[PDB]
PDB file of C-alpha atoms in Angstrom:
ATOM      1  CA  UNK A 116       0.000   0.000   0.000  1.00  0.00           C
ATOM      2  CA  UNK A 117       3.028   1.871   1.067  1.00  0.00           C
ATOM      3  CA  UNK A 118       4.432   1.673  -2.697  1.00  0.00           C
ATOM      4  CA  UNK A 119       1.058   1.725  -4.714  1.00  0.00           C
ATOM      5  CA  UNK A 120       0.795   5.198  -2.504  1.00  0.00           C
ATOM      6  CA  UNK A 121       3.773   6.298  -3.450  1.00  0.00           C
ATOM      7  CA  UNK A 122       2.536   4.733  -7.130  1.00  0.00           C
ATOM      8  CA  UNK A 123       0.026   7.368  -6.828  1.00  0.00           C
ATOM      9  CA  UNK A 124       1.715   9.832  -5.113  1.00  0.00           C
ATOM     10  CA  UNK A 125       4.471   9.915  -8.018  1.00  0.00           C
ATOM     11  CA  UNK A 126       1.431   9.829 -10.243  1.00  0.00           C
ATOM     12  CA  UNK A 127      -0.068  12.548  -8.883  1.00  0.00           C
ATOM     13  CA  UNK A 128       2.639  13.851  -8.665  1.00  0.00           C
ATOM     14  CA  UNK A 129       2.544  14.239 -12.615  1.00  0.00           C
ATOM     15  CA  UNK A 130      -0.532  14.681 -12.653  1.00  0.00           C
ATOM     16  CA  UNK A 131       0.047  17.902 -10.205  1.00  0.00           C
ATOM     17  CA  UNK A 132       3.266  18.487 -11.734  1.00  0.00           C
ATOM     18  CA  UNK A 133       2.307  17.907 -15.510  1.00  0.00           C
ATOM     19  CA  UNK A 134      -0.635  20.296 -14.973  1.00  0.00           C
ATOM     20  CA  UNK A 135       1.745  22.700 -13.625  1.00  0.00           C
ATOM     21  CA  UNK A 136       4.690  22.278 -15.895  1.00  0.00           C
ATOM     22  CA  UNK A 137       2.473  22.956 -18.454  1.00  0.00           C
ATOM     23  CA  UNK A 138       0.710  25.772 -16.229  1.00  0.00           C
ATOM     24  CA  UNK A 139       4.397  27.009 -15.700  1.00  0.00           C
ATOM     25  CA  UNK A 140       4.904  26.614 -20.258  1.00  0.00           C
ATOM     26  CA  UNK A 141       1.964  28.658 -20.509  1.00  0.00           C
ATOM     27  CA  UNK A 142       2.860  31.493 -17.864  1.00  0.00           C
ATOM     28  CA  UNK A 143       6.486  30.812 -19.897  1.00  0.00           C
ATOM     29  CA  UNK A 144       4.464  31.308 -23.142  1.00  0.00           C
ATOM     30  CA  UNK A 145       3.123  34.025 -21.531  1.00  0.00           C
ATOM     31  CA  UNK A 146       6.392  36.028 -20.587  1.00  0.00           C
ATOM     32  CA  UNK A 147       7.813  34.815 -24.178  1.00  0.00           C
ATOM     33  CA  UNK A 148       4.772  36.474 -25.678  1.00  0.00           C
ATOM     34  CA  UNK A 149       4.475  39.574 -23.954  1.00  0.00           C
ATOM     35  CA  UNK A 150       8.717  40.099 -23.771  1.00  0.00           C
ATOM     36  CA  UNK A 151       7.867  39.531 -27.672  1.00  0.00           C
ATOM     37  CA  UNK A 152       5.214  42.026 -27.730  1.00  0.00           C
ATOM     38  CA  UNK A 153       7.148  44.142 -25.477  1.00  0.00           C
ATOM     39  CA  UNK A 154       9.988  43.605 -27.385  1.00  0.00           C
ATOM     40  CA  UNK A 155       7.927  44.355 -30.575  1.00  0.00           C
ATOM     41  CA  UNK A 156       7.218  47.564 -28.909  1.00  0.00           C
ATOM     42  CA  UNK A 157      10.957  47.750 -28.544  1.00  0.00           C
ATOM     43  CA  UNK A 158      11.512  47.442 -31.654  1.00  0.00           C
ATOM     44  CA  UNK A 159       9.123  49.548 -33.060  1.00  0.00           C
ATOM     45  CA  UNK A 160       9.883  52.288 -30.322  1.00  0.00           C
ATOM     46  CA  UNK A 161      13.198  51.657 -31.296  1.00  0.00           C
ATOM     47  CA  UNK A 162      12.500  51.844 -34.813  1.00  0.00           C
ATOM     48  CA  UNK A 163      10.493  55.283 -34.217  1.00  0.00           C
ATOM     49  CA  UNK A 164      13.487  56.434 -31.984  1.00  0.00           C
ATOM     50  CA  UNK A 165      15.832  55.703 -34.839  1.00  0.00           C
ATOM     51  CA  UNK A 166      13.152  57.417 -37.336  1.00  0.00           C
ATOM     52  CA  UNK A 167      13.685  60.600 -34.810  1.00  0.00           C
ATOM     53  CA  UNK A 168      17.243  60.569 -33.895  1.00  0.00           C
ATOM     54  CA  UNK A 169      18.127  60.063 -37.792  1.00  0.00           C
ATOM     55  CA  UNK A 170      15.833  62.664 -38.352  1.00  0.00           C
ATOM     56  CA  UNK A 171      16.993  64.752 -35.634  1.00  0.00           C
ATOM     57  CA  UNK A 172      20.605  64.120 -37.386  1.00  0.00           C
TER      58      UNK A 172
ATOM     59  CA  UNK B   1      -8.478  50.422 -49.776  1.00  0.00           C
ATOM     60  CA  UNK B   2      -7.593  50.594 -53.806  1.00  0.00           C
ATOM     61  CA  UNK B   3      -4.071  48.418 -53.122  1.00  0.00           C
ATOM     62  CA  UNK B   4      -6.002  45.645 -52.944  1.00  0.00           C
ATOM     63  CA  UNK B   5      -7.399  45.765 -56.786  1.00  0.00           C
ATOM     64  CA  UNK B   6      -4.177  46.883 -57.289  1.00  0.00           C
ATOM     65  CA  UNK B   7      -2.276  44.205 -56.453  1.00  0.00           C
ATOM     66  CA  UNK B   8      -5.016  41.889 -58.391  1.00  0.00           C
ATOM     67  CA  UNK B   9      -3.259  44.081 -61.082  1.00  0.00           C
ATOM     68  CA  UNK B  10      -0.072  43.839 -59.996  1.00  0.00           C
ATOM     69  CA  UNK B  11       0.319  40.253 -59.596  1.00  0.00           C
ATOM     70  CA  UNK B  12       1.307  37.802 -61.712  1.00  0.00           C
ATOM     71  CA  UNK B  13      -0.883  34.874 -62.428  1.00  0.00           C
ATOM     72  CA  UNK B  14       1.305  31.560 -62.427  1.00  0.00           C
ATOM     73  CA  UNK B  15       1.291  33.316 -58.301  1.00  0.00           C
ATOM     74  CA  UNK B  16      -2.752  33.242 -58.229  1.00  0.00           C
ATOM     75  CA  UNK B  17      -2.660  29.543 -59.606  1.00  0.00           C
ATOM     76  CA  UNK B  18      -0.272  27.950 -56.458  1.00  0.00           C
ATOM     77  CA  UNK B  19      -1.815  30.966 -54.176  1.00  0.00           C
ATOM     78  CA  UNK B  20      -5.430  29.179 -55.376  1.00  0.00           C
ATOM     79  CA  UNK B  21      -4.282  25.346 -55.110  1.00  0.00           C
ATOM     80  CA  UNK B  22      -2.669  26.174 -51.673  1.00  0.00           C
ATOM     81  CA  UNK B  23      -5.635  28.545 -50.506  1.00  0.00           C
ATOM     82  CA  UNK B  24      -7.666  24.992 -51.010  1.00  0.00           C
ATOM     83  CA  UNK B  25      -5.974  23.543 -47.654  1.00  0.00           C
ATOM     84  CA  UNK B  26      -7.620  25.962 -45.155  1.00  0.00           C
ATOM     85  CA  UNK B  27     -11.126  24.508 -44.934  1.00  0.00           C
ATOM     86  CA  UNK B  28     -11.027  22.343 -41.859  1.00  0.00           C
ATOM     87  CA  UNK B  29     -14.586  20.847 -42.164  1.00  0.00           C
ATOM     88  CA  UNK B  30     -17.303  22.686 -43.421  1.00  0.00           C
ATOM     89  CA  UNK B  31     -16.034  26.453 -43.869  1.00  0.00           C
ATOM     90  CA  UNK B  32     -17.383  28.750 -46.046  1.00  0.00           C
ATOM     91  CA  UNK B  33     -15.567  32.238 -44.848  1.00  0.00           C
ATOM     92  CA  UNK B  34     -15.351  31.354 -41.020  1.00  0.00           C
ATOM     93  CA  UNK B  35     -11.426  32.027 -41.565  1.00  0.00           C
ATOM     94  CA  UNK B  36      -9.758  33.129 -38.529  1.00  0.00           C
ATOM     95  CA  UNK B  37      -6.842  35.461 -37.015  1.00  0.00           C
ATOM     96  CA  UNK B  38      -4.425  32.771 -34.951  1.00  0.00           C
ATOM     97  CA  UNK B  39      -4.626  30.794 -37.965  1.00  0.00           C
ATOM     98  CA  UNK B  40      -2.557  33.660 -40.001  1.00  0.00           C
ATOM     99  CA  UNK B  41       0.592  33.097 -38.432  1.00  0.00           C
ATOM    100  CA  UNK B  42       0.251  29.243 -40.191  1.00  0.00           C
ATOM    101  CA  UNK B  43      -0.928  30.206 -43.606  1.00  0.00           C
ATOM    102  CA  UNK B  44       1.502  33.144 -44.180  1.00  0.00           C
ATOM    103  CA  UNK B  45       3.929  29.764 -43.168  1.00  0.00           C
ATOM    104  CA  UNK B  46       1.994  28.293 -45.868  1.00  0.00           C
ATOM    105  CA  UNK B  47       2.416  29.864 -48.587  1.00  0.00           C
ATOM    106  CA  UNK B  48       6.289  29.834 -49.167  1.00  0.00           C
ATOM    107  CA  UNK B  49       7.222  32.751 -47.005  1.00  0.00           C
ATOM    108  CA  UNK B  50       9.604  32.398 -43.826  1.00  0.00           C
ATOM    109  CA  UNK B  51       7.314  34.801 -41.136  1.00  0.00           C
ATOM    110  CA  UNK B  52       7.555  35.667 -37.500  1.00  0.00           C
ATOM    111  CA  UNK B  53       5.111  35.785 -34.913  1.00  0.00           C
ATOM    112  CA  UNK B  54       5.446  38.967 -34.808  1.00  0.00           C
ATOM    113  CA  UNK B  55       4.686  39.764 -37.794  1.00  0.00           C
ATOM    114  CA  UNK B  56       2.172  37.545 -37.736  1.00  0.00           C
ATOM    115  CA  UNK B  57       0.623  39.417 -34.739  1.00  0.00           C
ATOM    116  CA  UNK B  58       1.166  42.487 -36.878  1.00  0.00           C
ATOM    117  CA  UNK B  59      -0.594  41.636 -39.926  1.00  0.00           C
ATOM    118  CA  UNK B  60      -3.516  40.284 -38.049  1.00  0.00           C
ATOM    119  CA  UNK B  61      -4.188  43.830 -36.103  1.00  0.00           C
ATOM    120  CA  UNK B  62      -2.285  45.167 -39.906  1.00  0.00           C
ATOM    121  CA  UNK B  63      -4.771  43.433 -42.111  1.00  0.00           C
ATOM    122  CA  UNK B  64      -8.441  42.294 -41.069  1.00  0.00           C
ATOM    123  CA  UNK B  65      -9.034  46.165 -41.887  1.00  0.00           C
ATOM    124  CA  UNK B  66     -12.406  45.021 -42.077  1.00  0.00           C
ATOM    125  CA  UNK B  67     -12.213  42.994 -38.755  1.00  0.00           C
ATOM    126  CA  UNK B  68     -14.123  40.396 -39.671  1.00  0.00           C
ATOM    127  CA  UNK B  69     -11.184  37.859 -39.288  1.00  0.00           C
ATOM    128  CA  UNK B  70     -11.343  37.978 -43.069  1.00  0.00           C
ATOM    129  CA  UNK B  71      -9.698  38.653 -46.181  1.00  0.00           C
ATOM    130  CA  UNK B  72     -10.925  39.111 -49.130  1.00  0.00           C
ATOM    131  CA  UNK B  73      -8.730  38.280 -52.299  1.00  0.00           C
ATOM    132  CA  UNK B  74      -7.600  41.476 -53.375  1.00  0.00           C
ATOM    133  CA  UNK B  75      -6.821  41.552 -49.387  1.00  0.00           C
ATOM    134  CA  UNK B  76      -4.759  38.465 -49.991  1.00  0.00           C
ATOM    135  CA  UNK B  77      -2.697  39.804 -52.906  1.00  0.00           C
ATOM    136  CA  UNK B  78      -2.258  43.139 -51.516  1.00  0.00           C
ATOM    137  CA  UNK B  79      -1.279  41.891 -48.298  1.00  0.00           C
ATOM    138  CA  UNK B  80       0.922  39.909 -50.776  1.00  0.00           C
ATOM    139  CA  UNK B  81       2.190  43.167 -53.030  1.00  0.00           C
ATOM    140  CA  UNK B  82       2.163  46.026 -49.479  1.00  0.00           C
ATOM    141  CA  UNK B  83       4.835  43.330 -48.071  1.00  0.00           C
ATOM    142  CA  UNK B  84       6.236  41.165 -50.693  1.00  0.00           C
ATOM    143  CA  UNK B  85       6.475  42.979 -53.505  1.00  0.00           C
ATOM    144  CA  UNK B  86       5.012  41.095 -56.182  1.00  0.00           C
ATOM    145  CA  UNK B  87       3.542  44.257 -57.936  1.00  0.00           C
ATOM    146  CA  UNK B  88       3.582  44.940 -61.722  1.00  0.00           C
ATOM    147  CA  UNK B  89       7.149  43.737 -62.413  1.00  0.00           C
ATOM    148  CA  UNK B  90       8.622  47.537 -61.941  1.00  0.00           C
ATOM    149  CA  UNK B  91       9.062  47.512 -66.084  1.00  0.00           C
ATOM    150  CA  UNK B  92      12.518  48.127 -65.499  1.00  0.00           C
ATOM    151  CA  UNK B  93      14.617  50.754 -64.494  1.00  0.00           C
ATOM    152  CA  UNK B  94      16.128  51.911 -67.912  1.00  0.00           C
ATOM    153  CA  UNK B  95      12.300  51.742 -69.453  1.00  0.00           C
ATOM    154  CA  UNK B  96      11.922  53.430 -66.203  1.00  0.00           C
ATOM    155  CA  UNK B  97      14.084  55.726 -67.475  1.00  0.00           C
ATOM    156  CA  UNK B  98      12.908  56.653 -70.510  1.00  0.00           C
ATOM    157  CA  UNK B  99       9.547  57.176 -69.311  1.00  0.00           C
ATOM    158  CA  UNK B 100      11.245  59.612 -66.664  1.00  0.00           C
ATOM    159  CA  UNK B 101      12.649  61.580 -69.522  1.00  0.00           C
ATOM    160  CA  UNK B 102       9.571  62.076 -70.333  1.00  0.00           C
ATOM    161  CA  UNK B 103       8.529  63.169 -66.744  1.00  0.00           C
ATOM    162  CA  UNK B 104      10.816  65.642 -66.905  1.00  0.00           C
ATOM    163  CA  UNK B 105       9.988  67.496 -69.767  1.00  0.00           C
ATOM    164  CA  UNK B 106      12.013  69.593 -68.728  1.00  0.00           C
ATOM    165  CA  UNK B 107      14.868  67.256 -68.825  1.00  0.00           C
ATOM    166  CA  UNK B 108      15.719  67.739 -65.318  1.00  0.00           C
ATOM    167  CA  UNK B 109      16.965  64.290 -63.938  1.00  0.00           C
ATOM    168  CA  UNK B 110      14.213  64.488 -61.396  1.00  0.00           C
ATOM    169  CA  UNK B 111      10.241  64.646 -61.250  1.00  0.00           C
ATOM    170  CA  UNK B 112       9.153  67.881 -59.181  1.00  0.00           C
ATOM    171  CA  UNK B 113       6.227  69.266 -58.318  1.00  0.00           C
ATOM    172  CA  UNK B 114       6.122  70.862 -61.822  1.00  0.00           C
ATOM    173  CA  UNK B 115       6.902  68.183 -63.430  1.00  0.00           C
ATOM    174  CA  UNK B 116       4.640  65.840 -61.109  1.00  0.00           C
ATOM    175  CA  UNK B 117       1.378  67.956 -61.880  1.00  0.00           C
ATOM    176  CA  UNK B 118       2.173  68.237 -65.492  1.00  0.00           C
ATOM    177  CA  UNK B 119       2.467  64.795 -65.987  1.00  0.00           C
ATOM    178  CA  UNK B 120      -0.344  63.928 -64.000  1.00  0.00           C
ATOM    179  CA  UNK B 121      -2.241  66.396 -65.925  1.00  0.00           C
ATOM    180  CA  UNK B 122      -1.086  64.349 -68.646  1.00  0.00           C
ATOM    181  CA  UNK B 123      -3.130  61.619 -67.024  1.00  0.00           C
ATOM    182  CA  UNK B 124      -6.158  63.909 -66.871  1.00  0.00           C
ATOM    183  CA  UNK B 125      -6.092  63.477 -63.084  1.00  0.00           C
ATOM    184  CA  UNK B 126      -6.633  66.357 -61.814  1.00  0.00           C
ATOM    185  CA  UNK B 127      -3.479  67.883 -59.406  1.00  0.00           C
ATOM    186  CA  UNK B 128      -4.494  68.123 -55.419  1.00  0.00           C
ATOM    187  CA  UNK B 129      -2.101  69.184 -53.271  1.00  0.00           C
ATOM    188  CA  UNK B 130      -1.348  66.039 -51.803  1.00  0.00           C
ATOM    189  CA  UNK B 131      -1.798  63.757 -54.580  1.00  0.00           C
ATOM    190  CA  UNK B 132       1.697  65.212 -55.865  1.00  0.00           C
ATOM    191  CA  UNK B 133       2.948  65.618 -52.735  1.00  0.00           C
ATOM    192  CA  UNK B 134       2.128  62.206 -51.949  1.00  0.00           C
ATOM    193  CA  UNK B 135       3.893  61.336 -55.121  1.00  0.00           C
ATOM    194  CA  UNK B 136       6.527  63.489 -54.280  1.00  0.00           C
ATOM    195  CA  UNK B 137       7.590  62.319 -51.058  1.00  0.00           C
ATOM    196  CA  UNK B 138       6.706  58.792 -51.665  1.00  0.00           C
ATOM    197  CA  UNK B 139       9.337  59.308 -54.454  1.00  0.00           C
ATOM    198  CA  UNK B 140      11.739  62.298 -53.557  1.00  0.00           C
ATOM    199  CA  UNK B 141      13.329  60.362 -50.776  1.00  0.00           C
ATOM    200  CA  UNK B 142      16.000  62.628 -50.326  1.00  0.00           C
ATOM    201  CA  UNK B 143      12.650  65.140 -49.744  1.00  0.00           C
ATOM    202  CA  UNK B 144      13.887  67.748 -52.015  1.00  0.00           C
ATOM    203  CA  UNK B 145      11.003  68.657 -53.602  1.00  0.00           C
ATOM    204  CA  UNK B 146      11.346  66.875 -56.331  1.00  0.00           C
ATOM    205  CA  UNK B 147      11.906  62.780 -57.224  1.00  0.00           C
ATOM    206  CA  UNK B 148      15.243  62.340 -58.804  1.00  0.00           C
ATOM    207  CA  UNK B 149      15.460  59.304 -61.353  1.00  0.00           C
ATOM    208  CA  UNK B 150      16.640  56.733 -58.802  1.00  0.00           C
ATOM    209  CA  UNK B 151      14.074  58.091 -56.026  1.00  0.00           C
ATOM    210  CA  UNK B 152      11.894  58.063 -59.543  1.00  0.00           C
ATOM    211  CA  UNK B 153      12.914  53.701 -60.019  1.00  0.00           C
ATOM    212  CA  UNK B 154      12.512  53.103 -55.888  1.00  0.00           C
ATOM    213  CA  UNK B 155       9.184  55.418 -56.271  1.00  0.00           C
ATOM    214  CA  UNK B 156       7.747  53.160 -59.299  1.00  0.00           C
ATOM    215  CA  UNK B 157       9.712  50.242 -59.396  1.00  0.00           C
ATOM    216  CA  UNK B 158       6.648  47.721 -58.799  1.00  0.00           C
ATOM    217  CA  UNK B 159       4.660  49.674 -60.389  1.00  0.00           C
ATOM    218  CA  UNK B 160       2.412  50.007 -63.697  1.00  0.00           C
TER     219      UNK B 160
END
């Protein structure tokens, strides 16, 4: 019973552990999407920083 | 707006052909114009182009002008010509040229304002302020007024 518990434990475990490694690849997805938006806005306020600063050259 | 029926025009049709027999895949069950936005970031992977999700992102607040998730055919090729640009073959740059002799009249080396409106004229369409101005700029790169032959090839290559 012992090891069948732990059987389960382990399992959920997983099941605790899958849900929240993919919980934790979807707040990961999250960051990677918004540092990508963010980043987007980086590059475009970059972009529109370069458009001003050659323009102010 | 009129880039759409422009690139219609300014695409070549061997493209339309694969653009058609690839546009076929889409449907997945039963769709009759139920297209949607997360699925642009796959068919602009489709169609033989190397794009970015951010660009994907982009072009699905950029295009769906109408909103509806959709795009219409001349949406597709513009979206095709405003990006990739697979316009009317830019004649040349040497027919280009010759035709820019013509622009200027004058024989200036460069398409002003004068030269702009009288050629336009030329057309029959009528000169507003901005039209040539809008030519102008979109073709005087160097903003002087006036588009120079090479600001005249980067202003019309692409173009009819």
């Amino acid at each position: 019973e012992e090891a069948e518990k732990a059987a389960d434990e382990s399992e959920r475990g997983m099941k605790v552990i899958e849900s929240r490694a993919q919980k934790d690849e979807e707040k990961m997805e999250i960051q990677e999407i918004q540092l990508k938006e963010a980043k987007h806005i980086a590059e475009d306020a970059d972009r529109k920083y370069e458009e001003v600063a050659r323009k102010l050259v | 707006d009129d880039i759409y029926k422009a690139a219609v025009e300014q695409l070549t049709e061997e493209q339309k052909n694969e653009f058609k027999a690839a546009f076929d895949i889409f449907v997945l069950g039963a769709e009759d114009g139920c297209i949607s936005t997360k699925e642009l970031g796959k068919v602009m992977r489709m169609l033989g182009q190397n794009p970015t999700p951010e660009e994907l992102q982009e072009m699905i607040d950029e295009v769906d002008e109408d909103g509806s998730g959709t795009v219409d055919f001349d949406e597709f090729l513009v979206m095709m010509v405003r990006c990739m640009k697979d316009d009317s073959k830019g004649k040349s740059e040497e027919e280009l040229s010759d035709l820019f002799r013509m622009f200027d009249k004058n024989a200036d080396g460069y398409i002003d304002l004068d030269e702009l409106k009288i050629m336009l004229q030329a057309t029959g369409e009528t000169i507003t302020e901005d039209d040539i101005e809008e030519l102008m700029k979109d073709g005087d790169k160097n903003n002087d007024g006036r588009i120079d032959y090479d600001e005249f090839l980067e202003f019309m290559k692409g173009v009819e």
